[PDB]
Amino acid sequence: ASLRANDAPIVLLHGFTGWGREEMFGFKYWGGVRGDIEQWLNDNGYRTYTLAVGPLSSNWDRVCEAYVQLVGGTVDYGAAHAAKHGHARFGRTYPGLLPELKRGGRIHIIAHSQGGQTARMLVSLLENGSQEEREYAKAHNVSLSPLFEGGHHFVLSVTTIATPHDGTTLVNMVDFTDRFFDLQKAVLEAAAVASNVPYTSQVYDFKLDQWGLRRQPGESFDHYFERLKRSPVWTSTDTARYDLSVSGAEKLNQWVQASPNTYYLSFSTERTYRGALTGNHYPELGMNAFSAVVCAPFLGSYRNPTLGIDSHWLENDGIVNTISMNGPKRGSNDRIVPYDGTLKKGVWNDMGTYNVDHLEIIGVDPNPSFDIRAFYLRLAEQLASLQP
Amino acid sequence: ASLRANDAPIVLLHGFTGWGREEMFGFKYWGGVRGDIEQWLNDNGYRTYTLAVGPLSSNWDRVCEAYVQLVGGTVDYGAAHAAKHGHARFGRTYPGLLPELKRGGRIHIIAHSQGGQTARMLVSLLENGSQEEREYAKAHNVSLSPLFEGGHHFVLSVTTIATPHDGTTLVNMVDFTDRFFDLQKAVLEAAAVASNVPYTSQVYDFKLDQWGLRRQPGESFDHYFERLKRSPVWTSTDTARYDLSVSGAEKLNQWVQASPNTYYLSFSTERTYRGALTGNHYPELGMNAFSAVVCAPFLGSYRNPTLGIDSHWLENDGIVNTISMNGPKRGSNDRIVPYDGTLKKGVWNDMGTYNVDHLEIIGVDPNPSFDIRAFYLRLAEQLASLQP
Ligand SMILES: [Ca+2]
Ligand SMILES: [Ca+2]
Ligand SMILES: [Zn+2]
Ligand SMILES: [Zn+2]
């Protein structure tokens, strides 16, 4: 084995789709059709909790919501940020899953997809806060969340799985808007939830209290998504959509840097093959059907030489280009090193590339030759082994 | 399709930025980074020409310059106007793009931003002349341009695109003068022209002979613009700056009326979203960067109750308040009617609001979701269908 060297709990964080345990009739994002990842970890002695933040919201907003769900309180988005983007300053209120974070407890965050951007941004906020929010607060005389002060530190490690640290070219597809929401619908269907029914109960809450957006009594997911597509959580720059783009991701990278206090681990995925006498990449047998028909072919061919989107960008997992996943590179100075058997603090420990697609790595799409329980249990044992 | 009912060629007219086909070396105002709109219309059978008048000059001066660019001759600003504002009576001399117009036939004018004011003014002069220039000429025994005589029905239609018919609140910003010249600097840089380089060749000629202003070869645009800011083309009432203001635009609307023999079409643009609880408008992802940072915020929040500049004025395309675009209203009796399939004479046929910004709509800023070719080919086809 490795020997347990820390007792930090694990916290799970989803991407641009995702929801809590009570949502979606209980079908879990972390485990999908394969079972319940949190429960398996807990059952094996690794305390684990799950976060639910806005799937379409910006990394900043998600990071504010996460802090509040972890420590307890009302989501405070920052008076400056909120004035700039025109949404409320305050979101929902949470009991707090781990109030010991205020007195020295720490955590391990395991994040999938965009969750990896959100996790990085939370560590950077904890540590350095935000100069702009500090200055706005005193100038306008309003209160200020401790999150924007800096000098807090409570994340021992961040692990990212299939994260677009450098963006994904998928956002450059012509009909990206309609295709992105058809993807949402496909994930709904993997969970046995219909997109043409006005469910009285909520089932998938987008957490859009700040923008005043809420599914209406009598409205289906089809109709809701048509409104979301025309609303600020899709058309502004304060969105997941902007942060997912190669250029948006680079801007985030310019200010969200690795902390020397925190171990970073990265997992990459791929599920494509290289075509004959082309550099193009094509979806492998078994890739989730939606991505195989709709996303994988564009991802495996779109090039932009002027921007450095070359041959190495075409390999993908059906949603994100594989090269984007080992850690932030564009607009960043973080260091990335191949895992060599000893994890190191303050740099990206590239744990390699797995032959599994974007939704398979979380159980949402089946893949019987992928032993997902062993993957997560082994990751938990490594996290458990990190020196404090 | 529809049937063609006139042979009237199309003439393109820019706004408060704009330059000739051979200027800005090749980078075209009409088409920018997307291509060359005049060329598409020509290659698709729609005969088309391009005018280039003083970008910062008053609508009157532009109109006079436009007249002479079309029928040929030496520009004539009118002796009364010239002595009143203190600039030369005569400007440049042109061969004429369509001297045949002097003896019959017609044109369709498609004009963007302030070109729309200019087009409306040309039509009014063509049809009514100027009583004032008539009296002056007679009282002083001096010659008179046929432009001021009246009785010339050269224009079959005027289509406006993002025109500030009731003005734009941008002019009310605290540092409008400095920011306006930064806007010019930004359009230069979109064509790759630097503002700190002492270009020997003209590159972008402001066509300010009447005022004796011209950039000295080897003078940078930075330096030139500094002189323009302190010159009459920035400081007098005979300028674009004044006609683009709310009161200036109301004054123009008080005398430039819709002619009964001409079809007017307006296209409106918007690229902002409404804030959750402020009524304010905010720039959408994708809006050209200069506007999004420097202009759209002020536009989407500036109100002046005294003048009825309301919540409805806040929606914008990054340069002009959208409500200003469907046609003249402040100080006008023109009738404006939503398009219902048939274009009517002597009124404003409001063709709708498009989700495109001020520069995207002429191709100067990119927007892959906007099919700019089809937008122009459809319009041309519609203009070709008009019954004279
Ligand atoms: Ca599969
Ligand atoms: Ca754009
Ligand atoms: Zn926000
Ligand atoms: Zn003048």
PDB file of N, CA, C and O in Angstrom, chain A residues 73-95:
ATOM      1  N   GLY A  73     -23.020  29.546   4.877  1.00  0.00           N
ATOM      2  CA  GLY A  73     -23.332  30.927   4.587  1.00  0.00           C
ATOM      3  C   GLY A  73     -24.076  31.108   3.274  1.00  0.00           C
ATOM      4  O   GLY A  73     -24.443  30.165   2.562  1.00  0.00           O
ATOM      5  N   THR A  74     -24.272  32.398   3.020  1.00  0.00           N
ATOM      6  CA  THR A  74     -24.886  32.911   1.806  1.00  0.00           C
ATOM      7  C   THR A  74     -23.805  33.170   0.765  1.00  0.00           C
ATOM      8  O   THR A  74     -22.768  33.783   1.029  1.00  0.00           O
ATOM      9  N   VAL A  75     -24.080  32.690  -0.440  1.00  0.00           N
ATOM     10  CA  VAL A  75     -23.157  32.865  -1.553  1.00  0.00           C
ATOM     11  C   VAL A  75     -22.978  34.366  -1.736  1.00  0.00           C
ATOM     12  O   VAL A  75     -23.969  35.095  -1.791  1.00  0.00           O
ATOM     13  N   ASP A  76     -21.730  34.818  -1.820  1.00  0.00           N
ATOM     14  CA  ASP A  76     -21.483  36.252  -1.908  1.00  0.00           C
ATOM     15  C   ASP A  76     -20.607  36.352  -3.148  1.00  0.00           C
ATOM     16  O   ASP A  76     -19.451  35.926  -3.157  1.00  0.00           O
ATOM     17  N   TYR A  77     -21.169  36.925  -4.205  1.00  0.00           N
ATOM     18  CA  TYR A  77     -20.418  36.941  -5.451  1.00  0.00           C
ATOM     19  C   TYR A  77     -19.441  38.102  -5.594  1.00  0.00           C
ATOM     20  O   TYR A  77     -18.714  38.195  -6.590  1.00  0.00           O
ATOM     21  N   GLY A  78     -19.438  38.979  -4.596  1.00  0.00           N
ATOM     22  CA  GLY A  78     -18.586  40.148  -4.709  1.00  0.00           C
ATOM     23  C   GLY A  78     -19.307  41.352  -5.288  1.00  0.00           C
ATOM     24  O   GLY A  78     -19.830  41.335  -6.403  1.00  0.00           O
ATOM     25  N   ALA A  79     -19.343  42.438  -4.528  1.00  0.00           N
ATOM     26  CA  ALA A  79     -20.043  43.615  -5.021  1.00  0.00           C
ATOM     27  C   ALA A  79     -19.506  44.163  -6.336  1.00  0.00           C
ATOM     28  O   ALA A  79     -20.290  44.548  -7.202  1.00  0.00           O
ATOM     29  N   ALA A  80     -18.194  44.179  -6.517  1.00  0.00           N
ATOM     30  CA  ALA A  80     -17.649  44.586  -7.805  1.00  0.00           C
ATOM     31  C   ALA A  80     -18.048  43.725  -9.003  1.00  0.00           C
ATOM     32  O   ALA A  80     -18.530  44.227 -10.023  1.00  0.00           O
ATOM     33  N   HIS A  81     -17.839  42.419  -8.862  1.00  0.00           N
ATOM     34  CA  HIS A  81     -18.171  41.471  -9.921  1.00  0.00           C
ATOM     35  C   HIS A  81     -19.639  41.618 -10.290  1.00  0.00           C
ATOM     36  O   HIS A  81     -20.064  41.704 -11.444  1.00  0.00           O
ATOM     37  N   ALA A  82     -20.459  41.644  -9.247  1.00  0.00           N
ATOM     38  CA  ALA A  82     -21.881  41.687  -9.547  1.00  0.00           C
ATOM     39  C   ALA A  82     -22.334  42.988 -10.195  1.00  0.00           C
ATOM     40  O   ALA A  82     -23.239  42.971 -11.035  1.00  0.00           O
ATOM     41  N   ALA A  83     -21.733  44.111  -9.815  1.00  0.00           N
ATOM     42  CA  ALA A  83     -22.084  45.352 -10.509  1.00  0.00           C
ATOM     43  C   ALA A  83     -21.630  45.316 -11.961  1.00  0.00           C
ATOM     44  O   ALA A  83     -22.290  45.777 -12.886  1.00  0.00           O
ATOM     45  N   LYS A  84     -20.454  44.750 -12.195  1.00  0.00           N
ATOM     46  CA  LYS A  84     -19.944  44.715 -13.556  1.00  0.00           C
ATOM     47  C   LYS A  84     -20.825  43.859 -14.464  1.00  0.00           C
ATOM     48  O   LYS A  84     -21.038  44.199 -15.627  1.00  0.00           O
ATOM     49  N   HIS A  85     -21.360  42.741 -13.988  1.00  0.00           N
ATOM     50  CA  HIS A  85     -22.026  41.818 -14.902  1.00  0.00           C
ATOM     51  C   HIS A  85     -23.549  41.906 -14.856  1.00  0.00           C
ATOM     52  O   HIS A  85     -24.212  41.280 -15.688  1.00  0.00           O
ATOM     53  N   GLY A  86     -24.052  42.668 -13.886  1.00  0.00           N
ATOM     54  CA  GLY A  86     -25.474  42.922 -13.737  1.00  0.00           C
ATOM     55  C   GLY A  86     -26.283  41.771 -13.162  1.00  0.00           C
ATOM     56  O   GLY A  86     -27.387  41.516 -13.641  1.00  0.00           O
ATOM     57  N   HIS A  87     -25.776  41.065 -12.155  1.00  0.00           N
ATOM     58  CA  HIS A  87     -26.535  39.989 -11.537  1.00  0.00           C
ATOM     59  C   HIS A  87     -26.526  40.249 -10.038  1.00  0.00           C
ATOM     60  O   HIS A  87     -25.824  41.155  -9.590  1.00  0.00           O
ATOM     61  N   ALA A  88     -27.289  39.502  -9.244  1.00  0.00           N
ATOM     62  CA  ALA A  88     -27.318  39.841  -7.825  1.00  0.00           C
ATOM     63  C   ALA A  88     -25.977  39.548  -7.162  1.00  0.00           C
ATOM     64  O   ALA A  88     -25.196  38.692  -7.581  1.00  0.00           O
ATOM     65  N   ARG A  89     -25.726  40.302  -6.098  1.00  0.00           N
ATOM     66  CA  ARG A  89     -24.523  40.105  -5.303  1.00  0.00           C
ATOM     67  C   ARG A  89     -24.585  38.807  -4.504  1.00  0.00           C
ATOM     68  O   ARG A  89     -23.565  38.159  -4.268  1.00  0.00           O
ATOM     69  N   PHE A  90     -25.794  38.435  -4.093  1.00  0.00           N
ATOM     70  CA  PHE A  90     -25.986  37.363  -3.132  1.00  0.00           C
ATOM     71  C   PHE A  90     -26.799  36.245  -3.768  1.00  0.00           C
ATOM     72  O   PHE A  90     -27.774  36.473  -4.481  1.00  0.00           O
ATOM     73  N   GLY A  91     -26.379  35.017  -3.491  1.00  0.00           N
ATOM     74  CA  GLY A  91     -27.134  33.853  -3.914  1.00  0.00           C
ATOM     75  C   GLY A  91     -27.812  33.165  -2.749  1.00  0.00           C
ATOM     76  O   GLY A  91     -28.266  33.788  -1.790  1.00  0.00           O
ATOM     77  N   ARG A  92     -27.883  31.842  -2.839  1.00  0.00           N
ATOM     78  CA  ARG A  92     -28.564  31.034  -1.841  1.00  0.00           C
ATOM     79  C   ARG A  92     -27.726  30.914  -0.579  1.00  0.00           C
ATOM     80  O   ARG A  92     -26.549  31.234  -0.582  1.00  0.00           O
ATOM     81  N   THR A  93     -28.335  30.426   0.489  1.00  0.00           N
ATOM     82  CA  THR A  93     -27.669  30.232   1.761  1.00  0.00           C
ATOM     83  C   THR A  93     -27.533  28.738   2.042  1.00  0.00           C
ATOM     84  O   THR A  93     -28.442  27.962   1.762  1.00  0.00           O
ATOM     85  N   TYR A  94     -26.394  28.331   2.597  1.00  0.00           N
ATOM     86  CA  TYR A  94     -26.059  26.939   2.868  1.00  0.00           C
ATOM     87  C   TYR A  94     -25.656  26.748   4.326  1.00  0.00           C
ATOM     88  O   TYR A  94     -25.066  27.631   4.951  1.00  0.00           O
ATOM     89  N   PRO A  95     -25.978  25.577   4.864  1.00  0.00           N
ATOM     90  CA  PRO A  95     -25.584  25.211   6.227  1.00  0.00           C
ATOM     91  C   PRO A  95     -24.080  25.052   6.420  1.00  0.00           C
ATOM     92  O   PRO A  95     -23.532  25.319   7.493  1.00  0.00           O
TER      93      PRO A  95
END
